[PDB]
Design a binder for this molecule. Structure first.
Ligand SMILES: [Cl-]
Lengths: 75, 71
């Protein structure tokens, strides 16, 4: 049994109210997590390209962002 | 919002039967869970002491060294 160095990808941000954070790829919804207000960290996600992150807030407001992603080469 | 890569190390090993694996980080119990026979990974953990109790009642204690890269 051994200790292994792994690197997991996450997307971090801030939610205004307590919200639903949706992660889209190419139109396809991949993540969907309800979070408390403030900072959030989204584990479990799908190379390189772009994600779309919508923060559906309690009052019906949608904070929409484009999140560029990339997988780094490791020796 | 931004994409980022977190250092997320794991303790890997092979359990012969449906086992219980306990991981100690210097005295404190850090992980204790039941695993099926075959390979196992232990994620999201707060030298390590890894104890593998197996179905037949046999137990082995391993000293697994751990390190964190400097950034
Ligand atoms: Cl929508």
């Amino acid at each position: 049994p051994y200790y292994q160095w792994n690197f997991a990808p996450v997307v971090r941000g801030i939610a205004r109210t307590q919200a639903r954070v949706e992660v889209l790829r190419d139109g396809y919804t991949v993540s969907n997590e309800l979070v408390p207000s403030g900072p959030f960290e989204l584990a479990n996600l799908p190379g390189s390209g772009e994600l779309k992150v919508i923060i559906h807030e309690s009052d019906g407001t949608k904070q929409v962002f484009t999140v560029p992603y990339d997988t780094p080469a490791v020796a």
